[PDB]
């Protein structure tokens, strides 16, 4: 075959809809996710039209390579989609109803600034290249767009699956291409991170601060440096969950700022000990007593400085 | 082709059965598992019926694309099934017997609340979309549903493979779809976890508690902080076996509660030492002697508080 | 096509043979292994028989989908086999010679009780489903079963590749199925494990025992707890080589028993120190001197208790 | 089919262009990256030419296996490309316009000398083998070469995608082959590495240096050796991001040089302690006080020695 | 089709050549590597021969399934090769020129005795099975065997790609098979390993030896045991780069021998301390002073004992 000829000089509207049956494998590091969904297309090809009265049953089915079907292709995917054709129904008036079920690996970027309290807007871009004999445009059949009540993306809640109704079209290598935008919004399930990363990472920090109620370098070094080792256990665990962002993550800031509250603690401790060899135990254990508040304070300030700075 | 015409105005019962030949790769983190099984279908298409007497042999075989075969598709899979067709036998009266062997990667969620003492109900959902010319319904051929005596899902015992006989059917994008539910129940083999995770994780905790029979900060810090390091070895090992649940796991609770019995131990130790610089060795080593029971008690209580809270 | 009609009322013998060209990727954790082998089949279909004298060359070749070929399928595989057809030769008398080379991922379980001193019996099960018009049986063409002198399964020696000549056949969903059993026996190359896991894991234990010739808690805690950290390095390395068995592995026992000889060492040390604060340096360093033999003894006993218990 | 016959004795120019739709998965260790792009070809086959006036619409479409299409193949790929054919338009004068969209895994080496401040020149080599009946040459259709404003290669900025216009051609196994060179230049997003690797790796080093303001071996050993442990945490993390280069990386130098500033620190410390048993506390704590500047100096020198040496 | 009939009673020589376009992914652990190469075949089938003077152009091209092409198959591969056919040219005299480009994952074992200073001989074995009607033999077209100036196998230098000209042929399941042997020799790029594994692993050892210039058990235990921890960091990193060999690696020996120079160091230290409690500070610090040379000596001896033993 080859396309429907234009009765006027109009371009052909093709009526698209994506209905999600599964979302799975949101891979943060990779900035991807797998989807499994119906893709539903719908266009007018009068060449196929017919008389219901004489022909018998209302609507006519075709095997795929019988009729002309538009080159609808996903933009932002790695795996060029794996699809079964489900039904092709042609209505009396030459209007076609195409349905495939597909699954593909989509490549939408994620913004980690607010990790692990972030939300995202995933993107499934649909395209169609316009042929020789006529232009083609896509548009949204808002009733053939949805998702399942099953659909669970482990570690995220799912807000909306909507579609930007207006396809911005444009010239790509001499011909026109029409591009739609489907939008899956999600919010990270942050609960996990409290008792798995934050509360522990804090306890091991707080332990470090017990060297303010001690005056034994021999022991304080152990206190602070050992807990720094323990903290390092949890920096290398968090920084490889995520990709190398060229912008600062919020968790990453918190974590990096902690590397001072160890560094500076060592300084205080190293000083308190210094002065006590230099015999000013008054001035030494002024500092050390100060710290007992300075540290918890400057922390609760500076986490609130950051909190605001990031939200 | 195209479907059997409805003699009355009835829908079309299709007679389904899944017989498991292999279950494997239950992936906890992914919330998936691979299955390899016969799918057996069975429907009435009178167009194919015949006279055995004037025939040859009793029953007639067809190559797949010869006859009309219903669009039976798995719902909750990532890999749209890999299938070889095994036999299509048509009985004299137009009743078809379809058999394929398939294997697919199924995506059923697991509830980790009781890990690693949990059990699960896996789900293989079968669907069929209803065509223009008539509706289609599924139902269970209870004699064509089973599993092998071979079948072993490493790290789980397998209870039942049954099927919810009544398919709840419903409207999806204008047409009807009929959905069955096959149910594989399993229970985790928890033995591994005793001598691999729990008993060790306890010994390293108990060691921490030897700092109640000591009065040497210089050493006690080492005792408690080192064992905390060792414990951290086993938190990062358990917390990446599993997915990030937004609900509290039972193992996760135990583990998180342990991070206090290190934190609080440090407090006690830090205090006992504090008081000894402030000269109340009586009051100091009252506490220290108390702890010798307080800790083991509050633990056996609070593990039994949790145990109950989770079971 | 459809099968050879039975001249008597006999079932059809199909003459099977597997010749291994490669075994590779024995995956302990997965309980699998990849094989790459000739599958050779051989049956009598008189419909194909012919006159050599008049027809020309002695034996006739056919492209696969020309003749009737039996549905031979592997039972215990994940990847339903990838096969090239190599030759189909039909002898004058209607006897067919089928040869494919295949490769597949086989799923045979392994028994780890004796790891890493274990041996295994891998299993490649061949099946054939019996048709409508006649029954089918498999049997072994003992001269078409072997393996290469190349074949190396890294980390295992390979004993035998034999086949249980008698196929136990049986009824599966109304029809007969005939199942053969091919058996690849292997023994683990345990040498690696001596200087990589056992000898080191022992040295770090023996170091722990230097705290019996010391009377400095400050230091002994360090000695024992540090070496316990080092030992933990090698428990988490061994326990993820293997799958979670619900039965006790021999290596796992040894390892778990070691977690006492650290625990109990801490006890002794914690005691020796205790008594020295309570002023019985005699009784304290009686124990400590006892231990110097108690420990190495109770170890050589209890590894020999286990050794016998497991062999 | 078979090629266009040469009107003169000229070779055939084929007009190539690659338009990148996605770059992703730059795998440093593997020295690869996945691309997804239009490949656009364009040649003159007069056999296909026609009269527009009589034939109807201006330009003629063909299904792929209808016409002769040149054997264009990618050189430096692992996955021999996955391609859909998009359009084949033949202009009146026998000039063909071929368009496929492809995606492939490209194998271009990366130079890590300046990691993680490096830039790279990726390479997509296009080839065509020349046939019996005539020679074939490639050349660049500079207007059909570009990339998207979407295209993001996580962790890199993308400079240019250009093409070396002149294909160097040559004899390979008796016949000619013509090879083009497309060039994707990129620069690593180094920001991530400051607060994730460098600043921490420095703090843990600076802590080591607090043992110059201390005179307690018992503690200094702890200070220096513990921080060396912490540093080892970050050497094994960096050295497995990257491949085993046979040339010195810049990060690797820095890191390896740090292993001296621990080694030499131990020496100083071990000495200061030695002398203090030998009773020259003057000479001992001359050294120690010297070091307080020697170390930070020799570091700022030697990082600047290297910095220059590498840039 | 079916083969060329033998004019005499000779077997058919088939003229093979492999030209490497890419080698990549030498996987030490797996004992594999991916190759991407031309396979070029060449045989005499007179049935295809012709008269150039009357037929027109010198040489005739055929689509693959037109002519008889020999069953050439790779022996030692996991992935049964992925191939495009490039050209089939038939010369006037019935001699065929076949060319495919293929890529496959080859399974050649590597000998790790001398790791990481080893070299290897990779193996790509070509086979052909001999038919009913006549025998087939392979042989090398030495001018159609080579490699690219591009070809880079990251972490190895590439010496030669040659072919054992004489195919040893043999009987496999009743018929003859002819097997060629192509040989890719490579040498490991060992530079990486000096500043990444050996020099550090030595510094951490040398630090251990600073406990000979100290007489503080409290501290020496820390010195030696901590550095043993640090060394363990680098044993578990080296021992999982490589497969479990049943023979001793050279790196593995060095590493295992190091586990004594920690063990024995502990002994010395544990002794020096013992004697100081038993009051022979002379005899104690005789040993300690001896060691200061004993250790570095016995090391430079015993690494040279081994060096020789392995080379
Ligand atoms: C020392 C620790 C040894 C623990 C062995 C528990 C026995 C068990 O595993 O008990 C099983 C129940 C699960 O309940 P179920 O629905 O009956 O299924 C299982 C039916 N079986 C048993 C017949 C197969 O889990 C529990 O209550 C777990 C108790 C918490 C123990 C955690 C220790 C914390 C420190
Ligand atoms: C230091 C790197 C910082 C990167 C942040 C980027 C832009 C400035 C901050 C903008 C506010 C962004 C927002 O909160 O939405
Ligand atoms: C902390 C979040 C906990 C969520 C679990 C929900 C309810 C508490 C437990 C109820 C019993 C549920 C059950 O185990 O059957
Ligand atoms: C604890 C779980 C024990 C599992 C194995 C059962 C019994 C111990 C050994 C029995 C003898 C088996 C054998 O050696 O063949
Ligand atoms: C010591 C091993 C050094 C290997 C690198 C090779 C040459 C030295 C550096 C040359 C400058 C390279 C450049 O910056 O262009
Ligand atoms: C311990 C296992 C050692 C095995 C090496 C085998 C034989 C002894 C060495 C012979 C020389 C082999 C060589 O190094 O080229
Ligand atoms: Cl697509
Ligand atoms: Cl499906
Ligand atoms: Cl290609």
């Amino acid at each position: 075959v080859s396309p429907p000829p234009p009765i006027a000089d109009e371009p052909l509207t093709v009526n698209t809809g994506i209905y999600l049956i599964e979302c799975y494998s949101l891979d943060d590091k990779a900035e991807t996710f797998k989807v499994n969904a119906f893709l539903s297309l719908s266009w007018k090809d009068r060449r196929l039209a017919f008389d219901p009265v004489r022909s018998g049953v209302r609507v006519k089915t075709y095997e795929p390579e019988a009729i002309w079907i538009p080159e609808i292709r996903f933009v932002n995917v790695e795996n060029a989609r794996d699809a079964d054709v489900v039904d092709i129904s042609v209505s009396p008036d030459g209007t076609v109803q195409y349905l495939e079920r597909f699954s593909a690996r989509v490549l939408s970027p994620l913004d980690f600034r607010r990790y692990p309290f972030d939300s995202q807007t995933l993107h499934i871009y649909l395209i169609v290249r316009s042929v020789d004999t006529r232009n083609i445009v896509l548009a949204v059949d808002l009733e053939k767009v949805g998702k399942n009540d099953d659909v669970f993306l482990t570690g995220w809640d799912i807000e909306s699956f909507t579609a930007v109704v207006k396809p911005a079209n444009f010239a790509l290598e001499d011909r026109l291409e029409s591009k739609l935008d489907y939008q899956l919004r999600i919010s990270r399930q942050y609960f996990s991170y409290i008792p798995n990363i934050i509360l522990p990472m804090l306890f091991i920090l707080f332990i470090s601060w017990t060297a303010f109620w001690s005056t034994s370098y021999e022991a304080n070094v152990t206190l602070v440096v050992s807990t720094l080792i323990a903290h390092i256990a949890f920096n290398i665990l968090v920084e490889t969950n995520l990709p190398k962002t060229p912008y600062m993550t919020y968790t990453g800031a918190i974590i990096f700022m902690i590397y001072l509250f160890y560094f500076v603690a060592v300084i205080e401790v190293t000083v308190q000990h210094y002065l006590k060899v230099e015999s000013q135990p008054a001035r030494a254990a002024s500092i050390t007593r100060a710290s007992r508040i300075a540290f918890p304070v400057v922390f609760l300030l500076a986490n609130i400085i950051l909190a605001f700075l990031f939200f």
Side-chain angles (χ1 to χ4, degrees), chain A:
Chain A
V1 283
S2 66
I7 61 95
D9 195 50
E10 84 273 26
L12 171 55
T13 269
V14 194
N15 262 231
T16 64
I18 303 181
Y19 178 81
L20 310 172
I21 302 152
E22 315 264 66
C23 318
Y24 54 106
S25 299
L26 191 148
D27 184 344
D28 291 87
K29 192 135 143 70
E31 301 194 76
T32 84
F33 73 98
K34 292 153 202 302
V35 74
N36 181 332
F38 287 147
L39 174 63
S40 73
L41 303 166
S42 198
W43 65 100
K44 192 159 51 200
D45 182 28
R46 282 170 255 276
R47 288 174 300 119
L48 302 164
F50 61 92
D51 192 30
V53 208
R54 222 182 12 68
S55 290
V57 267
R58 226 215 277 94
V59 151
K60 265 145 148 197
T61 344
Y62 292 83
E63 284 271 294
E65 105 305 323
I67 77 162
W68 176 85
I69 306 178
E71 291 200 338
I72 305 300
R73 294 183 327 272
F74 286 109
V75 179
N76 64 315
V77 297
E78 311 184 354
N79 287 125
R81 62 151 190 283
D82 184 355
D84 312 317
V85 187
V86 187
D87 201 28
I88 303 168
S89 275
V90 179
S91 23
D93 65 294
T95 305
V96 196
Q97 290 263 246
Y98 179 90
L99 189 78
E100 64 173 25
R101 193 190 172 189
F102 77 101
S103 66
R105 190 184 169 172
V106 181
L107 182 24
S108 172
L110 323 172
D111 165 34
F112 291 106
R113 265 159 267 278
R114 279 171 213 221
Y115 176 83
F117 301 113
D118 58 319
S119 277
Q120 304 299 342
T121 296
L122 304 177
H123 283 291
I124 305 180
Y125 298 162
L126 268 171
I127 232 171
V128 60
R129 194 173 176 68
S130 298
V131 271
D132 306 13
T133 49
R134 79 187 287 205
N135 275 18
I136 317 191
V137 153
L138 306 175
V140 178
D141 194 325
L142 292 145
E143 266 175 308
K144 299 159 81 75
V145 176
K147 59 202 181 292
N148 250 53
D149 290 334
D150 291 10
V151 164
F152 72 105
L153 187 70
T154 303
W156 303 83
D157 305 294
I158 308 153
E159 263 56 54
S160 65
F161 187 49
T162 42
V164 176
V165 287
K166 177 85 61 84
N169 313 329
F170 51 166
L172 173 42
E173 291 188 359
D174 268 4
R175 300 263 183 72
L176 181 134
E177 211 142 324
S178 162
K179 178 194 201 191
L180 261 170
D181 178 347
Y182 287 65
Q183 298 189 357
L184 177 59
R185 251 158 293 261
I186 46 172
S187 65
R188 188 175 262 110
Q189 291 167 2
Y190 65 81
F191 178 82
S192 90
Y193 294 91
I194 272 66
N196 285 22
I197 283 161
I198 306 151
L199 293 226
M201 181 170 280
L202 290 163
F203 301 140
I204 63 137
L205 172 56
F206 298 158
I207 288 155
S208 113
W209 295 344
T210 79
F212 303 138
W213 285 240
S214 168
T215 55
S216 204
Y217 192 52
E218 310 83 6
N220 291 10
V221 161
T222 312
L223 255 160
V224 168
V225 178
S226 303
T227 51
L228 172 58
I229 274 169
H231 179 86
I232 282 167
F234 289 63
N235 183 8
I236 306 187
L237 158 69
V238 139
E239 53 121 332
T240 25
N241 297 355
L242 300 172
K244 289 195 196 80
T245 40
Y247 55 94
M248 276 290 341
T249 54
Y250 162 70
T251 310
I254 279 163
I255 275 180
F256 167 93
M257 193 207 71
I258 288 162
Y259 279 73
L260 310 185
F261 284 51
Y262 284 85
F263 187 58
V264 149
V266 166
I267 301 304
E268 177 275 339
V269 158
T270 290
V271 155
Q272 171 198 40
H273 166 93
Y274 193 48
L275 304 199
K276 192 168 203 279
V277 174
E278 311 312 66
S279 304
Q280 102 136 288
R283 185 162 176 201
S286 302
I287 289 154
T288 303
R289 260 189 281 86
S291 310
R292 296 188 188 154
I293 283 87
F295 280 53
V297 163
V298 174
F299 203 60
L300 197 68
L301 293 200
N303 264 59
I304 268 155
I305 288 158
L306 276 187
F308 157 50
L309 263 170
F310 268 98
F311 291 68

